[PDB]
Amino acid sequence: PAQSVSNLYNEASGFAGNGKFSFETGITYARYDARDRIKADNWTLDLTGRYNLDNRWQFDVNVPVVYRESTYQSGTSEESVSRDPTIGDVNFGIAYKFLDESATMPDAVVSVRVKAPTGKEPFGIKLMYVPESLPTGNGVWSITPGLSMVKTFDPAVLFGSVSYTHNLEDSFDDISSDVNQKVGGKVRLGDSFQFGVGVAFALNERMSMSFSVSDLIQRKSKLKPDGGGWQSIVSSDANAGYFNVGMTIAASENLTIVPNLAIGMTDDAPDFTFSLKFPYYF
Amino acid sequence: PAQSVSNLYNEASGFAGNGKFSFETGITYARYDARNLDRIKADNWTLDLTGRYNLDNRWQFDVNVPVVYRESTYQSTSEESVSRDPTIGDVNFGIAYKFLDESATMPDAVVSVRVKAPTGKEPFGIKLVRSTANDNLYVPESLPTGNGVWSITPGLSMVKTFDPAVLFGSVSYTHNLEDSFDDISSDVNQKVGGKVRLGDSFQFGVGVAFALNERMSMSFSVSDLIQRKSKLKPDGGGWQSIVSSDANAGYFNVGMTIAASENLTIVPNLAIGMTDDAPDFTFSLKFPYYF
Amino acid sequence: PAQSVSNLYNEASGFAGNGKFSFETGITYARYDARDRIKADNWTLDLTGRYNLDNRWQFDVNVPVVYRESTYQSGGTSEESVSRDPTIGDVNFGIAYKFLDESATMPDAVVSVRVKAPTGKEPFGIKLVRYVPESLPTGNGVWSITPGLSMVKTFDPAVLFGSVSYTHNLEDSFDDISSDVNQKVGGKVRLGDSFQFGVGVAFALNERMSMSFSVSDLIQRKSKLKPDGGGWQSIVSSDANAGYFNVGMTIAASENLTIVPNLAIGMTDDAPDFTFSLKFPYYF
Ligand SMILES: CCCCCCCCCCCC[N+](C)(C)[O-]
Ligand SMILES: CCCCCCCCCCCC[N+](C)(C)[O-]
């Protein structure tokens, strides 16, 4: 099977099939904005290991490193806060390919992914103007099952995916933004679901190009301060649309370059995200 | 023959030169986010029911009924929401005439007009009810479903093949008719009758498309609609225009056409809003069944 | 050959091979809808002359003509409009040199310089009245020099391309650097410098037509003022980030004439919401 074809499937399905072991290195820049104003610049380095078994099972571990740099403007006045390279919410996932593509069926793949609360929690960080530090994960355990369907209708390859996320309830020693007090509390982050569709083409032996779209929807998040009852956090629910354009480029027989632009379609998504990924196959 | 070519043309022109009678079902989602009041989020679902009759690749007649479902959140801090369970929208109908057949030097041209009737729930006389939590947060008592008036919209389409790429374009404009109402205030304490005149508007856009294979097509296109501002005239006052009622709504579109079985087509389309007067995005799926 | 390939290269690289003299007329419409709401509609007619010397050197001069309409609404609602009838902008000119020719392993490489004179109406003199300006500028008021670089390369049927440049602005000075009607302050200005890059991909659809997808960013550093008083100062929100996503075509109308439609979608708040353009290079 051509090289371009193998890589279109790997990018689309999340399943690195032709091969056994792989280490992926990702670099990603994203950019946010607002009215006061508020610029932000996020760099993330992804490190990923993957073990693929017979092209039927797959296991992966993932470690993000996060450098961040924000600006809060309000007055005449402008002020920065930043965050030198730290982890990261660490996560692993398992995947099973249950249908292999035939003339009637597609390539179907079910998966699970568990994310641990290893980064710097937002809750308990203190403060017009301005935070003491920037977080690097959400502070909670989460578990996300999902599904990928992929199929070739020569020369198109259509693909899609759906997934939902459950966050587990968790408690914090401090829950207050106010520098003076220290209140502790429980948190139920709202569940969420995600989906996307797209089309791709093998342009030649080594290159492929992809168009796609996805939307993420985040249910409302509730809080329990010590003493009081439950209550929902206003403005906490979200809708983050993305339109994506992408390529795939075979460098060696084992190296691939994967560039991707992702244009935020709503306010809840960053303005744009350029990304760059380098899977290596031993 | 075609049949991706044929599907592609029906989409680009708005003219099913193919068969005779057909019936299109459409579902469409659209997200809004805006910014007294601080932000207003909105989820809009629409089911379209459309019947059309094509005649000899020369005339076409069409009827459309939208069913509308909307949900809207009003933030100030605190927050409240409001709904509209499936009611009908502005029913409308359309005539079109193919005045140029495509050739080695001329395109497919199609002149047409579309008339729209105020069957939906209008926005005039819907009251702002202050809650009940934020104390200077005003929230509408119900949500509208059409714009309360009649309108006529003539328009034109041009389509030409330059193998393998099919260019296309279109222009139209909407004249709205003046109407009167028992109540046009949104104050719960007062009732003020009046007449209203919505701003007329014009739309245009261009695109390209391709037959990827015997059964699929893909397209890219762009558009802009521009709207003159609207006016109200209480009794017995004079016409006053309303600031911010003017608009410019630009859209960028990716779409496909997929032939499921000769009778059925599936037509997915993403429209990305480029301006604040357009919704942020709009997915849609349409299912023309050909009898 | 083909013409589709040639037109496509001229568009990615900014460098017309395959001709001697040429004249380009371009028309651009841009839409701003910002934050108080400053809504604005700009058109620009661009007139450009071009001389390529043996597919090696090239000299261009460009004259922009600029029409504007802005509209400001109350806040600290009622609208008020301002406009600026056709008026010459920031005349510029550039030289270019192709240092690598495309082979089985080499890209097509062009190095270049663009010099921009301050021939348009400067922003600094202009006065606020009431809270709205009594006119609109047509350029930025300073000299600037801009070296650039570009690469293009076929990997059949894909043509990959990319480019990068920076702009250095030259410190200047003005009789009036204020906008308060009741005050006339002299001073000296350093417009912040900037770094532009973008990348992209393009395909020949047939012997006449090409299609293009690309993206680019512009990063601008902060501007500074020195009043007569008086030492240097940062203007607080003068820095910028303007990102863009582009879809385009080239159509071969005839042997001499290409039509170039381009849509550019603003992705950040420091960019027009959108921009349409048509260009008509004519090759004598
Ligand atoms: C970034 C917004 C959320 C995108 C949602 C995409 C669905 C995730 C499905 C998991 C399967 C893996 N893969 C690569 C197809 O995404
Ligand atoms: C400012 C430069 C403008 C270009 C000058 C106009 C030249 C007119 C000649 C038109 C050519 C017609 N033709 C090819 C049939 O000869």
Residue numbers in the entry:
A (entry chain A): 88 to 122, 143 to 182, 192 to 243, 252 to 406
B (entry chain B): 88 to 122, 141 to 181, 192 to 406
C (entry chain C): 88 to 122, 143 to 183, 192 to 245, 253 to 406
Any passages from the paper?
We also mutated the conserved double-phenylalanine residues (102FF103) that stabilise the position of the plug within the barrel. Interestingly, F103A FapF was fully functional, secreting FapC in an amyloid-competent form, whereas mutating the neighbouring F102 to alanine could not rescue amyloid secretion in the ΔFapF background. Furthermore, unbiased molecular simulations of the F102A/F103A double mutant showed that the whole plug is more mobile, and in particular a helix begins to move out from the barrel in one of the three subunits within the simulation timescale of 100 ns, leading to an opening of the channel. Both mutations were introduced into FapFβ and purified as for the wild type. Suitable yields for crystallisation were not obtained for FapF F102A; however, a crystal structure was determined for FapF F103A mutant in which the same overall plug placement was observed within the pore as seen in the wild type.
FapC is the main fibre-forming component, with FapB and FapE present in the fibres as minor subunits. FapF is the membrane protein pore component through which the FapB, FapC and FapE substrates are secreted. Therefore, to provide insight into mechanistic basis of Fap secretion, we solved the crystal structure of the transmembrane domain (TD) of the transporter FapF (FapF83–406), termed FapFβ from hereon. The TD of FapF comprises a 12-stranded plugged β-barrel (FapFβ), which forms a tightly packed trimer within the crystal.
